[PDB]
Amino acid sequence: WTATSGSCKGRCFELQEVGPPDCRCDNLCKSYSSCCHDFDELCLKTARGWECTKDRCGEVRNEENACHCSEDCLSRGDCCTNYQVVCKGESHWVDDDCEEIKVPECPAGFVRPPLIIFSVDGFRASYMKKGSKVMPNIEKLRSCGTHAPYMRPVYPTKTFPNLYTLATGLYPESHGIVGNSMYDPVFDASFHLRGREKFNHRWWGGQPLWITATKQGVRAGTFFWSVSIPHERRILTILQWLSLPDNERPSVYAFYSEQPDFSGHKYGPFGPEMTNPLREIDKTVGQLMDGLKQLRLHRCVNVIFVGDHGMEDVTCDRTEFLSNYLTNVDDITLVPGTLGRIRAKSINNSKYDPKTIIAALTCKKPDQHFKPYMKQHLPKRLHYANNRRIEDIHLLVDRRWHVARKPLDVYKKCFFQGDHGFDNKVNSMQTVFVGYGPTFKYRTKVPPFENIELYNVMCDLLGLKPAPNNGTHGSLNHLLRTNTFRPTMPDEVSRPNYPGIMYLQSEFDLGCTCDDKVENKLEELNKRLHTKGSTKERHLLYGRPAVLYRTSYDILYHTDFESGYSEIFLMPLWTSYTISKQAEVSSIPEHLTNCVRPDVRVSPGFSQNCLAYKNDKQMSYGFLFPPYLSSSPEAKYDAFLVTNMVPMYPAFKRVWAYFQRVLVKKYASERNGVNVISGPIFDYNYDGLRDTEDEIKQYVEGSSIPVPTHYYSIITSCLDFTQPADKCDGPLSVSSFILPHRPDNDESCNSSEDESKWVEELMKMHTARVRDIEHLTGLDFYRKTSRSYSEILTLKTYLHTYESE
Numbered sequence: 001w002t003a004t005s006g007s008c009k010g011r012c013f014e015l016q017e018v019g020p021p022d023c024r025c026d027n028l029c030k031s032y033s034s035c036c037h038d039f040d041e042l043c044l045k046t047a048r049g050w051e052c053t054k055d056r057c058g059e060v061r062n063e064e065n066a067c068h069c070s071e072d073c074l075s076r077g078d079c080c081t082n083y084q085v086v087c088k089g090e091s092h093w094v095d096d097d098c099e100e101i102k103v104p105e106c107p108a109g110f111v112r113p114p115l116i117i118f119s120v121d122g123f124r125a126s127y128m129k130k131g132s133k134v135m136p137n138i139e140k141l142r143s144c145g146t147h148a149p150y151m152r153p154v155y156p157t158k159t160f161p162n163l164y165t166l167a168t169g170l171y172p173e174s175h176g177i178v179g180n181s182m183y184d185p186v187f188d189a190s191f192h193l194r195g196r197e198k199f200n201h202r203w204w205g206g207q208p209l210w211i212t213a214t215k216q217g218v219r220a221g222t223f224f225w226s227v228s229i230p231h232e233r234r235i236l237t238i239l240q241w242l243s244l245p246d247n248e249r250p251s252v253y254a255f256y257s258e259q260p261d262f263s264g265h266k267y268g269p270f271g272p273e274m275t276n277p278l279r280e281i282d283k284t285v286g287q288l289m290d291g292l293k294q295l296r297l298h299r300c301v302n303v304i305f306v307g308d309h310g311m312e313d314v315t316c317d318r319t320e321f322l323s324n325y326l327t328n329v330d331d332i333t334l335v336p337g338t339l340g341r342i343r344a345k346s347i348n349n350s351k352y353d354p355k356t357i358i359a360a361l362t363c364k365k366p367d368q369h370f371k372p373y374m375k376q377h378l379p380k381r382l383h384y385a386n387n388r389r390i391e392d393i394h395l396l397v398d399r400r401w402h403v404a405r406k407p408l409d410v411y412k413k414c415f416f417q418g419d420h421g422f423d424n425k426v427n428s429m430q431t432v433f434v435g436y437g438p439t440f441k442y443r444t445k446v447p448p449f450e451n452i453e454l455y456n457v458m459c460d461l462l463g464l465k466p467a468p469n470n471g472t473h474g475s476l477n478h479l480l481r482t483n484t485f486r487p488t489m490p491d492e493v494s495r496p497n498y499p500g501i502m503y504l505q506s507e508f509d510l511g512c513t514c515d516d517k518v519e520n521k522l523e524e525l526n527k528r529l530h531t532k533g534s535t536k537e538r539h540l541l542y543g544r545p546a547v548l549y550r551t552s553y554d555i556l557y558h559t560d561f562e563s564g565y566s567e568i569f570l571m572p573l574w575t576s577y578t579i580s581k582q583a584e585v586s587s588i589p590e591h592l593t594n595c596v597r598p599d600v601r602v603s604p605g606f607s608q609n610c611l612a613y614k615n616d617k618q619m620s621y622g623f624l625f626p627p628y629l630s631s632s633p634e635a636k637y638d639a640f641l642v643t644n645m646v647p648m649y650p651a652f653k654r655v656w657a658y659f660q661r662v663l664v665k666k667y668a669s670e671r672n673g674v675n676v677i678s679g680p681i682f683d684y685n686y687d688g689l690r691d692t693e694d695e696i697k698q699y700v701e702g703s704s705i706p707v708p709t710h711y712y713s714i715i716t717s718c719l720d721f722t723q724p725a726d727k728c729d730g731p732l733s734v735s736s737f738i739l740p741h742r743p744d745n746d747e748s749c750n751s752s753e754d755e756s757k758w759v760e761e762l763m764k765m766h767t768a769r770v771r772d773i774e775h776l777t778g779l780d781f782y783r784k785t786s787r788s789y790s791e792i793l794t795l796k797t798y799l800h801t802y803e804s805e
Ligand SMILES: *[C@@H]1O[C@H](CO)[C@@H](O[C@@H]2O[C@H](CO)[C@@H](O[C@@H]3O[C@H](CO[C@H]4O[C@H](CO)[C@@H](O)[C@H](O[C@H]5O[C@H](CO)[C@@H](O)[C@H](O)[C@@H]5O[C@H]5O[C@H](CO)[C@@H](O)[C@H](O)[C@@H]5O)[C@@H]4O)[C@@H](O)[C@H](O[C@H]4O[C@H](CO)[C@@H](O)[C@H](O)[C@@H]4O[C@H]4O[C@H](CO)[C@@H](O)[C@H](O)[C@@H]4O)[C@@H]3O)[C@H](O)[C@H]2NC(C)=O)[C@H](O)[C@H]1NC(C)=O
Pocket: 170, 171, 173, 174, 175, 176, 202, 203, 204, 205, 206, 383, 386, 387, 388, 468, 469, 470, 687, 688, 689, 775
């Protein structure tokens, strides 16, 4: 109910709301069916169209017209965006050369340059190059302002998860919009694009930009436009808002376009019918810009041009049916399409089994086009698990395909030729970013970055303090001329011990053997300097990492590698070593195959033991610094110290062995030496954050030796590869991964072939940012380099994606 009986005269697109039932006149009333009777007549005028014509120049103001070409229009703030070009001989914004904007040039009374966020749905990143001949306004923004060749959305690359990530800097798992379609079991409700449920504030977590602004006394234009309000009216309304008196005028504005997404779904991303939606978007941009120029705001406002996701070629016949795998296909509810999510059709059913469903979906057909996962086993870079709204079972679907439950679902629902929602590393899903204005740089290209980082920047552009979010504040400082936020290195919380030789061999009773009793003062002061950290500048290139939580740990030095050994988790938190281009792969000598030696620097009570691995029929063990890469027969003994040991399932040891024996050396060859940091990760509650000791669900049997959920490595070298890793005078280059530590290899369908046919593809899949590894371990890397901190934050947010160009 509304008493939809009040009026809207002088209230057209009002700025604060009114309580039901007083009728509404804001840009969302339509969607609430709560506009006043006269809203259309007064607020949605159309008479005469949206441009001036020569014979309108001068005219008697006529309140009926959608826009005015009269004389008092400039001062009423309601001319058609082309008024000056047509009636005062001015030029369109796009025809003007660009001139660097060194300082804001704003009208008197503007306390700060406004921000205008112009967002475009489905605007695939390659559109910038491929549609360039027909988007001249967008092209001028891109080349005069600051731009990335593309910007990475979050997963799933759906509309609501992405628009609300842009608004909040949060992963969908934390903001709560985990799909365009969700079931919440605690609310017992569903959320869909169509319908009222999405209007209930209980779905939306985090604190979006417009709320952050309000709470700190920066006024916001209302970001959301009802779908019948056409584009030209949205632009005119923003331009009017911009004419309000100083005390009423918002500081931040949003425009949203449903194009090109709406068309991309019908015609595919490069369909002939796509040229027109693009021209249209360009023309709307020209109108905002010709309108800012009229108001002398075009060298004052910062404009952000940003997409939520891209678009891919998808058709009804590229659909895989779950009914071709599962016999019980009626006890399951599938959330379907470009990703799959499965729950039980009823929780009154005690016969519903995730394991057998997963197994029934694993590697069943030669060319299968989706892969099932338990959510905690999805790649950590998707950050897609820590929400009750995300179903335990998930299917990652290949680009260009759909998954559906039955065929009846597809023909009682080819409609479409495009879709999106796939893995966020996929090229066709990448989207756009352009920043133009006094606060952005002039004609500057920046590297690709993730859309989670933008909320921070929009907060800086407005002088706001960001609510806590998943961006890394400072990682996009290179986008900006000024306003920057000066980030600082977090303080180290635990400082290490440096233990010397304190224990005799016979104090150990670990059930470990080593064939090593084989026996010169010259080579002795030598081996001892290695244990004092003589070679430490070679293996520890960027400083030791900082432990950012409270705990007990020791630095251990060796000829070949250095480690931070945790007395709590009984293993190292990190192991650092450099492999130069020249270095040589040796084999594990036969005599030393089962060798594990006590560390006389570390007490029996803080040590693992071999007995437990023997007793544990599931669990075997590996080494963090690989014996294969020892610099000498003598140094190799160090690789076998029990303090270099970590627990590993036999299935995982195949992955790990291949990475250490083949791939390190290969990377050293291509990158001209690599520095490697490796270590264990514990995330039993899949929240993306380091577990405390009391959260560990699994131990090597009959011991306090905790089992990692994943193993990471960070592989750094010189960006200029003509310099070796250990003597780089400039920027660094990095790639990393976080491998799930799994007792089987059901994830790789080719895992019964040689490791050279599958291990590396798996690693690629589990590519990571150094920043993801920091969250997971509580460590802080790259503490001592010659680079600026800003540049290091950018490096820590890099993801190496292995897509082509
Ligand atoms: C990405 O960035 C985000 C944001 O920075 C990071 O998430 C933060 O991480 C913190 C650490 O996990 C977490 O802090 C906790 O908050 C608890 C209360 O928080 C409420 O208030 C805030 C502030 O305004 C609000 O944001 C929260 O909103 C969540 O919940 C509602 C649903 O109820 C959602 O609508 C909303 O979208 C959001 O959902 C998400 O968050 C929750 C976690 O709160 C998840 O469970 C969901 O899955 C969803 O993803 C909250 O309403 C606070 O009570 C916690 O305190 C406990 O632990 C500390 C240890 O310091 C201790 O002092 C206390 O004893 C306490 O323990 C007690 O509570 C336990 C739980 O009941 C109980 O088991 C014990 O026995 C005790 O009784 C804690 O400080 C913070 O909430 C989130 N923020 C957000 C927005 O998610 C995120 O980590 C980053 N991600 C990565 C990978 O880096």
